[PDB]
Amino acid sequence: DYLFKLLLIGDSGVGKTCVLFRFSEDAFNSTFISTIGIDFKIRTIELDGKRIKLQIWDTAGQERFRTITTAYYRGAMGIMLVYDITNEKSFDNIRNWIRNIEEHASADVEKMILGNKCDVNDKRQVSKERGEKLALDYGIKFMETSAKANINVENAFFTLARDIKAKMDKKH
Numbered sequence: 001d002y003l004f005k006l007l008l009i010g011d012s013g014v015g016k017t018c019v020l021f022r023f024s025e026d027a028f029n030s031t032f033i034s035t036i037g038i039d040f041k042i043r044t045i046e047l048d049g050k051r052i053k054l055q056i057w058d059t060a061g062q063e064r065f066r067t068i069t070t071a072y073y074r075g076a077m078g079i080m081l082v083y084d085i086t087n088e089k090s091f092d093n094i095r096n097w098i099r100n101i102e103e104h105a106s107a108d109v110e111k112m113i114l115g116n117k118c119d120v121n122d123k124r125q126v127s128k129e130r131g132e133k134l135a136l137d138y139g140i141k142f143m144e145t146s147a148k149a150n151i152n153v154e155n156a157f158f159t160l161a162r163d164i165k166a167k168m169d170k171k172h
Ligand SMILES: Nc1nc2c(ncn2[C@@H]2O[C@H](COP(=O)(O)OP(=O)(O)NP(=O)(O)O)[C@@H](O)[C@H]2O)c(=O)[nH]1
Pocket: 010, 011, 012, 013, 014, 015, 016, 017, 018, 019, 029, 030, 031, 032, 033, 034, 035, 036, 059, 060, 061, 062, 116, 117, 118, 119, 120, 145, 146, 147, 148, 149
């Protein structure tokens, strides 16, 4: 059945690993252990009766693997651009990521922005409408997710996968 590669991209500690863990194993680890070695996961979804194998590449947020993370753009097909709603600096840094993808990844790559840590509204620094407006500016999808609270985690991955399926099916 169909195989889609997926990139989780963002600053260190936005919750990329936790987002993949909630998608893969429907669980949450309150601990923060930074990703060093880029590791992929296969998560099988069903879109309109078709099984699609999502090869999800969980990249390291640390600056010393920027050059290493970028190398994984080849054949990526889809990229989750994750920032932390409680961290404007991470949100400011997704502009840099989106720009890097436009220049270095293929034109037909599908992009979505996730406002992660959406459950923690108390420490919110980034308004939902500021993420929506940025997504609108670049003409890409956006939704607020919580890996901890399991909000829009499946929805985000099904939304992105559909946009990849739609472009792929239209080639015929
Ligand atoms: N409240 C809350 N905390 C979250 C959520 N997602 C992740 N976190 C927390 O944020 C921290 C970083 O999560 P992690 O998945 O390791 O982030 P990362 O972006 O993969 N980090 P790195 O790029 O360095 O590997 C952890 O303490 C984790 O529990 C979420 O949806 N809600």
